[PDB]
Amino acid sequence: YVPDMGDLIWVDFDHRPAVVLSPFMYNNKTGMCLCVPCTTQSKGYPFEVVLSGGVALADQVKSIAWRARGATKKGTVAPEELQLIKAKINVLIG
Amino acid sequence: YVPDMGDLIWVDFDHRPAVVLSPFMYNNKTGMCLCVPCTTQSKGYPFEVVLSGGVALADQVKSIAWRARGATKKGTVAPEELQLIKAKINVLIG
């Protein structure tokens, strides 16, 4: 398994699922991916994106070592959901 | 001290300096900032940005709790350096 853009993944720990934002070829070459965490409770807060099936926290992007921490695919997000997450990060650091 | 976009900061630990990418008003309201880490040795690697005075690792952006971990201002980066870091992240997750 190599994560792809728009997957929902769980990572191992010593967890909350995450939405993968970087492309397959970056992910495979480096063993890392950029992603944002998800929580269960909606809260009006401006950087939340509602997922159908979660709320993604777009402002908390992170680089994560997916390969060295054994990631598992939980599902995928809708394409309009992914595109909303990218647009909120872009406003913040674009 | 509240970090601003383009500052170089050290954070406390239990470190490497970081270039701040998010705006002052986000930083002040939340107590968090998005930033990228710096290392000392250049390496040809494609996501490096050379700093004059470091190499910023643009692909390793992270959300960091600056307030709750006592940040100190080390200096600032050149405006063309900051703009190069933002453009490489944009290619990767824009």
Side-chain angles (χ1 to χ4, degrees), chain A residues 1-14 16-28 30-44 46-61 63-94, chain B residues 1-14 16-28 30-44 46-61 63-94:
Chain A
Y1 173 62
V2 186
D4 202 23
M5 180 175 133
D7 294 352
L8 269 170
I9 67 168
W10 289 288
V11 166
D12 224 335
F13 62 101
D14 275 68
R16 292 177 308 183
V19 188
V20 175
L21 305 178
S22 49
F24 179 103
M25 296 294 282
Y26 177 90
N27 304 336
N28 197 14
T30 68
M32 315 279 150
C33 68
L34 283 157
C35 58
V36 303
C38 298
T39 193
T40 65
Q41 295 191 314
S42 241
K43 200 197 236 81
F47 287 86
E48 295 174 11
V49 177
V50 178
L51 307 170
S52 212
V55 332
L57 302 174
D59 68 322
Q60 302 170 38
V61 20
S63 185
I64 90 114
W66 70 266
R67 172 171 291 143
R69 300 164 69 188
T72 315
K73 186 173 167 179
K74 162 171 188 163
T76 61
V77 299
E80 184 102 90
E81 291 155 9
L82 187 62
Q83 286 317 296
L84 243 308
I85 293 163
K86 285 165 179 228
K88 290 188 188 194
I89 290 160
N90 251 87
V91 165
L92 182 65
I93 65 178
Chain B
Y1 173 62
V2 186
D4 202 23
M5 180 175 133
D7 294 352
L8 269 170
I9 67 168
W10 289 288
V11 166
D12 224 335
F13 62 101
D14 275 68
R16 292 177 308 183
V19 188
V20 175
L21 305 178
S22 49
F24 179 103
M25 296 294 282
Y26 177 90
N27 304 336
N28 197 14
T30 68
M32 315 279 150
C33 68
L34 283 157
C35 58
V36 303
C38 298
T39 193
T40 65
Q41 295 191 314
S42 241
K43 200 197 236 81
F47 287 86
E48 295 174 11
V49 177
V50 178
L51 307 170
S52 212
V55 332
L57 302 174
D59 68 322
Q60 302 170 38
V61 20
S63 185
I64 90 114
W66 70 266
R67 172 171 291 143
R69 300 164 69 188
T72 315
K73 186 173 167 179
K74 162 171 188 163
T76 61
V77 299
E80 184 102 90
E81 291 155 9
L82 187 62
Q83 286 317 296
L84 243 308
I85 293 163
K86 285 165 179 228
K88 290 188 188 194
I89 290 160
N90 251 87
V91 165
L92 182 65
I93 65 178

